[model samples]
Target: NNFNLHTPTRILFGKGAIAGLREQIPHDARVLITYGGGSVKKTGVLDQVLDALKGMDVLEFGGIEPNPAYETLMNAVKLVREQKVTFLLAVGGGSVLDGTKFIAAAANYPENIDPWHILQTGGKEIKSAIPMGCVLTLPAAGAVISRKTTGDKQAFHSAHVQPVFAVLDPVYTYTLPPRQVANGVVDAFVHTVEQYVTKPVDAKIQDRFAEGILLTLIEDGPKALKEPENYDVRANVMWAATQAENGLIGAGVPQDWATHMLGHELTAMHGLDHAQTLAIVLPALWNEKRDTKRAKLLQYAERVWNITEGSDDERIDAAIAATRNFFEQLGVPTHLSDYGLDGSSIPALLKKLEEHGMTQLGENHDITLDVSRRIYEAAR
Candidate 1:
């Protein structure tokens, strides 16, 4: 019932929110627009940003890869410093924003300290970063504000670089292809599940918020994939994705990002889309950890899926099936075998987790390396 909630990012959300870009960042600060492989220019979203920010001393860094590599991010960080950039603007999807967080934080680190240590240690030493903002072109867009490093395929979390503001214009997302929209739908759904599916904490306000989001995704995800230009559905999916990972809906709520950790591994290993890996690992993770997560899983089954008549076990089973099908309907498969890598790399995946110092993960730290094996196995 009791919780502390905070989201520092100023949000401008609407059909043409990019017009506010010039008004948000300081006029004198040099701005660098960080975009990725996805065509920001083609979508006309970048042009909107350029028009909104006309006359500002803005620089551009394109070619941020899907999963944003550490080495690649270092290149951006170097440019940010070399160019004397004052503000950072992430102009693509999750990967570009993820990379931007790291670039902002790492560039500001005092000399003699290895920034990789921040990644190795998960940003505990993080304190501040250059103020950043976003012009989101994809559905996953921007969540309130937030770290991140993924090039080494590692996750470094911190808020210092959380965007000072986020501009979510559903119009920008209209040009994203179907597969991208599908992954975004699943990505948002999984973000909510990762936080909401954990053990209950009597956080009634949060539970209701989380449930509303899940229900919204369930209804709107398919429509977004099928008709990207449908303004209402696109707007709904965009805001839903932004809030799912924004941290407020799960404030003080325990979260099991084991799926994300394991999912990140798949992206690192096979170059799978982040959301695709999430779709694969989540159902497997739920199946492997069923008994341990029974209470919340049952709640999820009832509230999110309306499976109220079945036996407790039956309800949970149905819930997971629905969850997997949710992704399937959005064009994401719920298993590793769908990608055809088999179990050959399972050992290497486990080893990578350890190397990342993720020996004990999950909300309760119950997803040990061995548990991860079970999760991975089920995915296959």
Candidate 2:
């Protein structure tokens, strides 16, 4: 269990963190603020952000979709280049942040290379990118990003594009719809699961951080929905979302992103919310990989779910059931059938997986297409 851990993103938390935003970027920087939908505008967040950055050269690009699209993001790339935007401020949820990340990298990408190639190459080709920061209006996912092209969801990770700073004022999340709130909860939950429920590395610090995040999300996620205005609840869940996927808990540990890969296909083909897709895939995928993941599954049961009395099989089953129930209780259904989708598209899904070269997946890289097919069928 050896790795180099670099968490470069500075987080400005608590109330009124937005006021400190202007200082994070250079005063002379040409800034492009990116956002999703019009919620931030309607909730007055857009104005607040604008006011905070007074005297800075700032422009706005809205309508970054729930799953940031390559086409839309490329337009932003165009804006960044045409305007010579030197910095980016993402003002919505993961979508906006992700879209801004792509814009930053693509804007600096070589003229000879297609920007879309960045995703295909997993951001390895990225040499430089525009500096960026964020105001997290929603708190389900983390800072690392993904994008979609022709309904195919793909992701890329690079140290270059990680946010320079993040202003996480949980009050900004108060106006989120119940559905989005629950989606954020499930997204954060699965993000933790991906890193934690893998073969152990004897990394106790990472394990504890992961478990603490899971516990916080489990306790506060539902409360956020019921107490949408409660500053403390929103703050707790928001911080949990950040910690769940921010590389610390995953450093020096094996991580299984098979659920994310399968879920991305479901979203690309069906337009399911990313979190919804994750909920549908994770339990089934975990069940399919139970033998390989037995140790971590049992640990998850005992530590995360407090199920210490049952046999290994019983404990694992209860753990899976508990996970499904948690998502369901948060108003996020855990099966395709729950959303009126079924195994009818499993072949199409598998075709996409094969085309994407996702045959070898999971922490152990043994999740072949056959295994994925079974998981999808079972999820139905």
Candidate 3:
């Protein structure tokens, strides 16, 4: 009975949570409001945020892209220091939150510690950071609660950078464009599978929580795609994204995020959407790693996909195909060729992984450069 789960962020969830921003944000705090390109403005969320924080000192930082770049985030860090900002509020999707996390850490440091250090080597004991919060508009990436941020310098690196609080309002996501909604659903599902379908352990509680998240993604994902404006559908995805990466479901389990590692290279190389890249690589990785992931894959088949009547090998194959089909149904392309990717891209991505010392990229620490190349080729 040894399990550890730590989620430091306080979440204010449901429909009207954004309205409480006035109370949650400290009065007269020098703040930097971070956002993505103009979507929040079009959805009327920018107005709501500004109106809520009318009296407070807030400055805007926009055009933070999906896989936020180091150069873009460094500029924000400089602005935070120049403005003497004390609090940071990210007003858009995971990119905003991830960028703000980097800004917070970079602002507090005396010398410019390489931004890549936060991802590759972890921050040097985050003694103090500008208290950060989120008004999350995208129901994916789960940066609101998780201490992880994904970025690429040659290849992808996942950093542990925690936020202070998160505001999740389902109403805000109601106006999300259709492609974003589809991407969110697929991202949340892949996040769950990256942890759940790893090698099995005796961690019962974590297993159940992961299974529940997978079940919800399967049940509500398509509904959200079909009816993007449905409050119930949006709410379910919003909650699933929050729960997916909060460290609760992977507690005391030996998890493998090889899929995310492999998928990130695809994103960095092809400029594919993050979730769409994930949808392409995850099933392919699972298929390649099935021998090592056999026991847990069987459990996922039985509990989440309900393929209870099959031989061990049959169940595993069925589960993998089912997961791929699920992403397809959500309008995510499940193959590399679906995005016009070819086998020649594999060596370049493999070199990037090797250069970053991502030789041991997965939970088992067994996914070497050769294995990574094979996985990419299989995905293609």
Candidate 4:
């Protein structure tokens, strides 16, 4: 059987879709509206959301960080329990939505099970969760469409949590600062590569979708960065980010998110942006795992980079370099050393991963701790 899963989110996409929120949200729903820091305040989206929810019982939860930490999510979960928030509306970027998802699940879980366990052992069939939605102000992370959220607990164990619903209004992204936009573009690009570059059976259709997103990122991503007001470029990047990780390209494939895994450690340790961590780690990951990933690496070269003139190994190396160059073009550094990180941090990071029992990581199940150390060293 060939199975494909697009998304469960009832996405209301495109410009001016925020107007539809008034009807979509229930009148009697006691709402917890979530946001990250104060970006929305300056951008007018917070005012827009409040205006739309004028009659609803809306409460605000702010200060969700870029790679939302367990400490912050726990605070939101406590608020949900205390106030009996029946619905959630995340109104910023992916971090807000991701944190809200964790809050929803933690709110509903039995007190005996730690919420972190859901990421470790996977969620038991969730019987009931507070219905949540998003009004995305950024085009990356696809929190509006995917059943996934990523967070760091204790600055080490990186957890990918999934959410319920996402509201995608591209116009909200218009006011994003250039650096955030660059990070979003890089995040979307790496998200596609993390899954598609792994060895898996029956992944032809998946590869095509992944390649399509990569092409869009390479073309539209730079355009969005160069001309933030270009509606056409922004629109394509918005869709690409939304589709990058909604499981449409992951069905019947062993999805490898080792890049994200390692990147999270960097973000947690150095306070790097999520996309910046990915930018530094993915090329290193490809370099270290090149032998195991050679076949798919060749495909990445052909499909994504269009480098058909070189030997197989040369093409793969070119593809890896291309990935780094793409990020470098966007003004993102592609090495740990460039960010002032070195071998000294490796032991500390490894100890944390060990504490989390991450002895085995990656999709191919080959990223053992020893391999992780090497990948980190390569990045350095």
Candidate 5:
């Protein structure tokens, strides 16, 4: 993999791997297990974690939102400071993990640093961060690894943050409702599509890895939705979601997260689920970027969608059809109007994008606000 990639985190996955959580946690550290609402508690996931880490000086600061608000996390920062927390254990899905990344890094900001600096500038200004462990309750959840943050509904990526280790037991995810499982399927699928659909770099291994994850999501998404207690299917989807964007296939490959940037706005504006926003934006985003991403789109048509009989443009169109169909079948609506928005609201969203400095986004930095505006129409 001569691309020189590394995500410095230990990851253990299995049916009961959470039994070893204490081992993954720091031996002499003060720990705070963070979660969202009461899914972990209701699911008995928190109980297992507490049992394994019994006798450790542990505390919890829950109420991390589904999108993980920056305001809420700042409160957790207060707790981490007041309680002398040296470590963080994220006990839910990716948003929980993302909240922890912000907390872990922000708690250690230098005397005069605003925590928002790392978020606003995405600079190397972070001098220190508390280490973290993850007990992923979402099967093969991809969010546990990547560092994405949101404040006022816009999201950003940061380096220098990841779990110290993650605990994943398929059993932990069995409590998720069917729609949540389907949401996960669409989320993981779009994540890989973001990294894989850009221009080629002769990244053979990367290409194959993306294809495999896409195929896996397609196969396991419906089954995971139907068979909530099926350990094997949950395991398959969970791991695929995790592997989709752990900086492996995307490790220095040509890429684009234009969809994510646009989707974040929908969530901010309308309170869409994270993956629902992704499904809504991705098809439109791809359709708009089709000419720029021609070769890869055709490659995806042949390799990922197995459409061999079409002409060049026809195949690309078919691939997008498959993408839209896959997301719809996963139970997500594929357009902005599907969320009840109208032409009147689109301009304000464009303004928000410009205000957030998202005028030119994506792998090529060619996705301008003007281009985004048209895609909003297409999305409608």
Candidate 6:
């Protein structure tokens, strides 16, 4: 674990975290707040954010999609340039934050360089982006931001595009629909599992950190559903989600994101919510990759699920089943048939995966296209 870790994003959490917004954003900045549909307005979060930004030169660009479309984000880049927006405030979930990150970087790209090139280069060409912060209304996945274009979702990471601050008041998640809440928990769970359930490297600190987040999610996720307005449950799930993907638990770790890769193609092609695809893919993927991931799977079984009685295969299989049942208990379906789909689309999905050059995926790079197809088929 010799990696150099850097996470400078400041986080303001708990109730009334938005109260710190004024101090986080400079008064002189020509600000633009981006958000998803109109959920913020209905929740009065937009009013709260606007009240916080009262005296500033604030403007808004709403309707940033869940997957955050390239064209829509480019439109926002155009708006940012036209209005001379000096700062960005993202007021929704990961998608809005991701779109803001893209707009921040793309607004500063050279005239000759298409902003789409930013993703193609994985943000290598990005030198600067507008200063930005976010209020996470849906606390599922952390903002490992990216964009989708022409149905091909792509990701890019640049320190320049990282949020200067994040406001994560769990109260903002109180009004989220059960579906979104379930998705958030599943997403966060998979995010942690992806990083933590690979072969161990003796990174005890990271391993424990990952397990803690997993434990928190498993304990609090369903509670959030039952006690919709319970502050503690919301707070725990929110913080656990942020911790899941904010890089610490993943640092110097082997991460198998083949689940996410396969899920992305499913989202691109089927219009499935990100977590729904994840729920469907993950159990099947764990089954497919169980051999290579045997040791960690066994560890996950005993540690995360507390399964002490079983053969190794039985433990791993029980872990996978436990995961699927967990998602199902959260009201998330774990199969393509549950969504009324079939293997009819597997060929097309494989084609998209091939086009994206996802022929080899996962931490060990053993989840080749053939394996991916089998995972899809198993999910079906």
Query: For model 4, what is the C-alpha lDDT against the true structure?
Result: 0.78
The parts of candidate 1 lying over 4 Å away from their true place are 1-4, 69-83, 111-121, 126-128, 139-151, 354-359
lDDT by residue (tens digit), candidate 5, 114-187: 67776665535666688888898884312222223524443344455567788878878888887788888888
Question: So what's the TM-score on candidate 2?
Answer: 0.91
Highest TM-score among the candidates is held by which one? Answer: 6
What order do you get sorting by TM-score, best first?
Answer: 6, 2, 5, 3, 1, 4
RMSD of each: 3.5, 2.5, 3.9, 4.5, 3.4, 2.2
Cα-based lDDT for every prediction: 0.83, 0.88, 0.78, 0.78, 0.81, 0.88
Model 4, 1-380: lDDT tens digits are 26645455677787788777877777998899988989899889899999989988999999888667677777888899889888888888766776777677768878666766544434444555667778888753122212224543431111223434456777777888889889988988888887788884656787889899999989889998888888888999999988885678777777788888888778767888888999988999999999888888998898888999979888988999988999999989998888888769998888877876777888868799999999999988
Native-to-model Cα distance after best TM-score fit, residue 361 in candidate 6, in Å: 2.0
Q: Look at candidate 2 and give me any clashing residue pairs.
A: none
Give, for candidate 4, the lowest lDDT window spanning 10 residues: 152-161
In Å, residue 285's CA in model 6 sits off its true spot by 1.6
Give the per-residue lDDT digits (tens) of candidate 1, residues 233-252: 99999999888978788778
lDDT of 5 at 193: 82
Lowest-sum lDDT 10-residue window in model 1: 141-150
Model 3 worst lDDT window (10 residues): 140-149
Q: In model 6, what is the error at residue 332, expressed in angstroms?
A: 1.0
Better candidate by TM-score, 1 or 4? 1
Give residue 353's error in model 6 in angstroms.
Answer: 2.1
Residue pairs whose backbone atoms clash in candidate 3: none
Model 3 residue 52 lDDT?
85
- TM-score of each predicted structure versus truth: 0.87, 0.91, 0.88, 0.85, 0.89, 0.93
**What does the lDDT read for residue 148 in candidate 1?**
33
TM-score of 5: 0.89
